[PDB]
Amino acid sequence: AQYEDGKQYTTLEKPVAGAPQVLEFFSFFCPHCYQFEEVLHISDNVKKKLPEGVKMTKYHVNFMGGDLGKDLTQAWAVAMALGVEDKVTVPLFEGVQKTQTIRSASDIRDVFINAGIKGEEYDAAWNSFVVKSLVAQQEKAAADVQLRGVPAMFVNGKYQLNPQGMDTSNMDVFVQQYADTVKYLSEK
């Protein structure tokens, strides 16, 4: 067939109950994640082809970058809580990986301040239990899909995208295949 288990995607031995319909994992420290988001625009290309009524969820991971990596997961929680993901994703990626001007929790906060989030608003979110649960949710989701690496994407808690089974020659053909595969999986 055109889409095959073991080729464009794999199937989780242990399907995740109540998982987000489309779940992406990343780290702001992850070079391939920078490529996925800032050059390939995988998330956005996936979103453009998704069926009506299918939401995309994106979680950060702790295991790269030590203390700062965890600070970044907490800041991503803040971004989700405040609904400002599309204002901070690019400057966080660039701050960590392009300029390398993000070296502490304060440097992360500066990105939000510069993007127009009020200091009081950021600090209240940062120290909130809503954000602590969002951090825990991200960690629990990683456990649930038995996550080994990033970037990664899972559909309906059942299927794992397998980019190594797709074409890598033309970036653009790759991105289209990846996006087409997520849409196929969402309808499966």
mmCIF file of C-alpha atoms in Angstrom:
data_model
loop_
_atom_site.group_PDB
_atom_site.id
_atom_site.type_symbol
_atom_site.label_atom_id
_atom_site.label_comp_id
_atom_site.label_asym_id
_atom_site.label_seq_id
_atom_site.Cartn_x
_atom_site.Cartn_y
_atom_site.Cartn_z
ATOM 1 C CA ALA A 1 0.000 0.000 0.000
ATOM 2 C CA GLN A 2 0.914 3.662 -0.217
ATOM 3 C CA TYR A 3 1.016 4.147 3.565
ATOM 4 C CA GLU A 4 2.590 1.240 5.462
ATOM 5 C CA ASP A 5 3.198 0.371 9.099
ATOM 6 C CA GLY A 6 6.971 0.287 9.473
ATOM 7 C CA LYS A 7 7.529 2.745 6.646
ATOM 8 C CA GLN A 8 6.030 6.244 7.125
ATOM 9 C CA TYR A 9 4.792 5.504 10.629
ATOM 10 C CA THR A 10 4.947 2.870 13.336
ATOM 11 C CA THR A 11 2.325 1.568 15.758
ATOM 12 C CA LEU A 12 2.640 1.856 19.542
ATOM 13 C CA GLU A 13 2.491 -1.488 21.349
ATOM 14 C CA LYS A 14 0.695 0.314 24.163
ATOM 15 C CA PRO A 15 -1.903 2.812 22.822
ATOM 16 C CA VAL A 16 -2.341 5.901 25.004
ATOM 17 C CA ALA A 17 -5.815 6.501 26.395
ATOM 18 C CA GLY A 18 -7.154 10.026 26.035
ATOM 19 C CA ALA A 19 -4.092 11.320 24.199
ATOM 20 C CA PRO A 20 -4.186 14.536 22.126
ATOM 21 C CA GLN A 21 -5.231 13.868 18.508
ATOM 22 C CA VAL A 22 -1.897 15.099 17.151
ATOM 23 C CA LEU A 23 0.934 15.312 19.676
ATOM 24 C CA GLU A 24 4.381 16.760 18.903
ATOM 25 C CA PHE A 25 7.442 16.651 21.210
ATOM 26 C CA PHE A 26 10.404 18.968 20.858
ATOM 27 C CA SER A 27 13.194 20.797 22.676
ATOM 28 C CA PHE A 28 14.442 24.294 22.077
ATOM 29 C CA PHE A 29 17.941 22.725 22.461
ATOM 30 C CA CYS A 30 17.363 20.193 19.707
ATOM 31 C CA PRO A 31 19.099 21.037 16.387
ATOM 32 C CA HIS A 32 16.764 18.837 14.325
ATOM 33 C CA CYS A 33 13.851 20.493 16.145
ATOM 34 C CA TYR A 34 15.141 23.910 15.032
ATOM 35 C CA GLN A 35 15.184 22.582 11.476
ATOM 36 C CA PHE A 36 11.708 21.056 11.859
ATOM 37 C CA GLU A 37 10.165 24.255 13.136
ATOM 38 C CA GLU A 38 12.155 27.131 11.670
ATOM 39 C CA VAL A 39 13.186 25.770 8.242
ATOM 40 C CA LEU A 40 10.832 22.894 7.388
ATOM 41 C CA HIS A 41 7.813 24.305 9.291
ATOM 42 C CA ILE A 42 6.534 20.792 9.992
ATOM 43 C CA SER A 43 3.904 21.800 12.584
ATOM 44 C CA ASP A 44 2.389 24.391 10.289
ATOM 45 C CA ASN A 45 2.338 22.091 7.245
ATOM 46 C CA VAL A 46 0.677 19.386 9.320
ATOM 47 C CA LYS A 47 -1.932 21.923 10.557
ATOM 48 C CA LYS A 48 -2.802 23.002 6.997
ATOM 49 C CA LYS A 49 -3.850 19.501 6.012
ATOM 50 C CA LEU A 50 -5.591 18.345 9.174
ATOM 51 C CA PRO A 51 -9.263 17.356 9.133
ATOM 52 C CA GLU A 52 -11.834 19.701 10.634
ATOM 53 C CA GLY A 53 -12.059 19.367 14.408
ATOM 54 C CA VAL A 54 -8.530 18.011 14.892
ATOM 55 C CA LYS A 55 -6.335 20.073 17.249
ATOM 56 C CA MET A 56 -2.509 19.986 17.300
ATOM 57 C CA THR A 57 -0.696 19.769 20.636
ATOM 58 C CA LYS A 58 2.995 20.514 21.149
ATOM 59 C CA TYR A 59 4.984 19.621 24.283
ATOM 60 C CA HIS A 60 8.527 20.471 25.328
ATOM 61 C CA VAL A 61 10.896 17.884 26.839
ATOM 62 C CA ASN A 62 13.358 18.032 29.736
ATOM 63 C CA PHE A 63 16.175 15.713 28.762
ATOM 64 C CA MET A 64 18.296 18.150 26.769
ATOM 65 C CA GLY A 65 20.040 21.059 28.440
ATOM 66 C CA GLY A 66 20.003 20.250 32.132
ATOM 67 C CA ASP A 67 18.660 22.997 34.333
ATOM 68 C CA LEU A 68 17.970 25.304 31.400
ATOM 69 C CA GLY A 69 16.157 22.529 29.570
ATOM 70 C CA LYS A 70 13.740 22.207 32.481
ATOM 71 C CA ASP A 71 13.392 25.977 32.668
ATOM 72 C CA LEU A 72 12.422 25.821 28.986
ATOM 73 C CA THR A 73 9.752 23.174 29.668
ATOM 74 C CA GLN A 74 8.353 25.404 32.418
ATOM 75 C CA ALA A 75 8.434 28.436 30.115
ATOM 76 C CA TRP A 76 6.672 26.441 27.400
ATOM 77 C CA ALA A 77 4.031 25.664 30.047
ATOM 78 C CA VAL A 78 3.724 29.408 30.613
ATOM 79 C CA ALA A 79 3.384 29.942 26.880
ATOM 80 C CA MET A 80 0.566 27.364 26.752
ATOM 81 C CA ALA A 81 -1.147 28.837 29.819
ATOM 82 C CA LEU A 82 -1.064 32.374 28.368
ATOM 83 C CA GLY A 83 -1.778 31.321 24.784
ATOM 84 C CA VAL A 84 1.312 33.010 23.384
ATOM 85 C CA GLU A 85 3.045 30.059 21.706
ATOM 86 C CA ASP A 86 3.043 31.810 18.319
ATOM 87 C CA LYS A 87 4.773 34.830 19.783
ATOM 88 C CA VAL A 88 7.610 33.085 21.557
ATOM 89 C CA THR A 89 8.446 29.961 19.532
ATOM 90 C CA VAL A 90 10.722 31.728 17.059
ATOM 91 C CA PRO A 91 12.632 33.934 19.547
ATOM 92 C CA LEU A 92 13.104 30.993 21.959
ATOM 93 C CA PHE A 93 14.535 28.797 19.184
ATOM 94 C CA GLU A 94 16.727 31.637 17.961
ATOM 95 C CA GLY A 95 17.746 32.625 21.483
ATOM 96 C CA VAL A 96 18.864 29.122 22.378
ATOM 97 C CA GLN A 97 20.318 28.012 19.062
ATOM 98 C CA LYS A 98 21.059 30.997 16.803
ATOM 99 C CA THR A 99 22.270 33.825 19.019
ATOM 100 C CA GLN A 100 22.851 31.623 22.114
ATOM 101 C CA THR A 101 21.748 34.557 24.222
ATOM 102 C CA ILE A 102 19.507 32.319 26.309
ATOM 103 C CA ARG A 103 21.614 30.889 29.095
ATOM 104 C CA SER A 104 19.406 31.288 32.172
ATOM 105 C CA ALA A 105 15.770 31.390 33.276
ATOM 106 C CA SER A 106 15.987 35.188 33.302
ATOM 107 C CA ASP A 107 17.081 35.172 29.646
ATOM 108 C CA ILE A 108 13.999 33.090 28.810
ATOM 109 C CA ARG A 109 11.769 35.554 30.617
ATOM 110 C CA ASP A 110 13.318 38.419 28.617
ATOM 111 C CA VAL A 111 11.980 36.844 25.419
ATOM 112 C CA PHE A 112 8.464 36.968 26.837
ATOM 113 C CA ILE A 113 8.919 40.544 28.118
ATOM 114 C CA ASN A 114 10.246 41.604 24.705
ATOM 115 C CA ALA A 115 7.284 39.905 23.043
ATOM 116 C CA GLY A 116 4.845 42.034 25.037
ATOM 117 C CA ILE A 117 3.954 39.735 27.911
ATOM 118 C CA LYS A 118 3.804 41.812 31.111
ATOM 119 C CA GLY A 119 6.338 40.885 33.800
ATOM 120 C CA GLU A 120 3.695 40.417 36.443
ATOM 121 C CA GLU A 121 1.728 38.212 34.031
ATOM 122 C CA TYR A 122 4.755 36.035 33.266
ATOM 123 C CA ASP A 123 5.825 35.724 36.893
ATOM 124 C CA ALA A 124 2.324 34.830 38.096
ATOM 125 C CA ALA A 125 2.100 32.119 35.440
ATOM 126 C CA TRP A 126 5.650 30.876 36.091
ATOM 127 C CA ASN A 127 4.938 30.325 39.776
ATOM 128 C CA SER A 128 1.387 29.009 39.275
ATOM 129 C CA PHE A 129 0.125 25.507 40.002
ATOM 130 C CA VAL A 130 -1.650 25.570 36.631
ATOM 131 C CA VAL A 131 1.839 25.737 35.094
ATOM 132 C CA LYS A 132 3.162 23.038 37.452
ATOM 133 C CA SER A 133 0.396 20.729 36.201
ATOM 134 C CA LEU A 134 1.246 21.670 32.605
ATOM 135 C CA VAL A 135 4.880 20.699 33.240
ATOM 136 C CA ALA A 136 3.708 17.418 34.754
ATOM 137 C CA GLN A 137 1.369 16.822 31.790
ATOM 138 C CA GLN A 138 4.256 17.217 29.364
ATOM 139 C CA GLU A 139 6.427 14.803 31.357
ATOM 140 C CA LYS A 140 3.587 12.281 31.709
ATOM 141 C CA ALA A 141 2.872 12.388 27.981
ATOM 142 C CA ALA A 142 6.534 11.607 27.268
ATOM 143 C CA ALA A 143 6.309 8.611 29.581
ATOM 144 C CA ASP A 144 3.074 7.459 27.963
ATOM 145 C CA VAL A 145 4.515 7.241 24.435
ATOM 146 C CA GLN A 146 7.793 5.842 25.845
ATOM 147 C CA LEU A 147 9.607 8.763 24.243
ATOM 148 C CA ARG A 148 13.226 8.172 23.240
ATOM 149 C CA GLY A 149 14.101 11.264 21.262
ATOM 150 C CA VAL A 150 12.925 14.480 19.614
ATOM 151 C CA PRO A 151 11.490 15.673 17.319
ATOM 152 C CA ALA A 152 8.598 13.208 17.500
ATOM 153 C CA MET A 153 4.918 13.153 16.644
ATOM 154 C CA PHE A 154 2.167 10.762 17.657
ATOM 155 C CA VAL A 155 -1.366 10.513 16.292
ATOM 156 C CA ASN A 156 -4.433 9.500 18.380
ATOM 157 C CA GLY A 157 -2.047 7.981 20.923
ATOM 158 C CA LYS A 158 -1.653 5.035 18.552
ATOM 159 C CA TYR A 159 0.759 5.883 15.746
ATOM 160 C CA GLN A 160 4.276 7.338 15.667
ATOM 161 C CA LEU A 161 5.562 9.304 12.700
ATOM 162 C CA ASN A 162 8.618 7.651 11.115
ATOM 163 C CA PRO A 163 10.430 10.333 9.087
ATOM 164 C CA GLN A 164 13.394 7.984 8.464
ATOM 165 C CA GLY A 165 10.991 5.932 6.329
ATOM 166 C CA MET A 166 10.111 8.940 4.126
ATOM 167 C CA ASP A 167 12.053 10.812 1.359
ATOM 168 C CA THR A 168 14.853 13.208 2.510
ATOM 169 C CA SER A 169 16.153 14.421 -0.900
ATOM 170 C CA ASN A 170 13.922 17.357 -1.426
ATOM 171 C CA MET A 171 13.094 18.964 1.874
ATOM 172 C CA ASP A 172 9.773 20.004 0.416
ATOM 173 C CA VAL A 173 8.788 16.522 -0.779
ATOM 174 C CA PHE A 174 9.752 15.292 2.721
ATOM 175 C CA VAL A 175 7.583 17.910 4.434
ATOM 176 C CA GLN A 176 4.632 17.115 2.165
ATOM 177 C CA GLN A 177 4.969 13.389 2.843
ATOM 178 C CA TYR A 178 5.180 14.007 6.573
ATOM 179 C CA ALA A 179 2.087 16.217 6.546
ATOM 180 C CA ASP A 180 0.184 13.816 4.232
ATOM 181 C CA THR A 181 1.074 10.947 6.562
ATOM 182 C CA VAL A 182 -0.284 12.731 9.638
ATOM 183 C CA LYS A 183 -3.537 13.427 7.795
ATOM 184 C CA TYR A 184 -3.796 9.761 6.741
ATOM 185 C CA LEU A 185 -3.198 8.677 10.343
ATOM 186 C CA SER A 186 -5.784 11.102 11.726
ATOM 187 C CA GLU A 187 -8.446 9.451 9.527
ATOM 188 C CA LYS A 188 -7.264 5.893 10.243
#
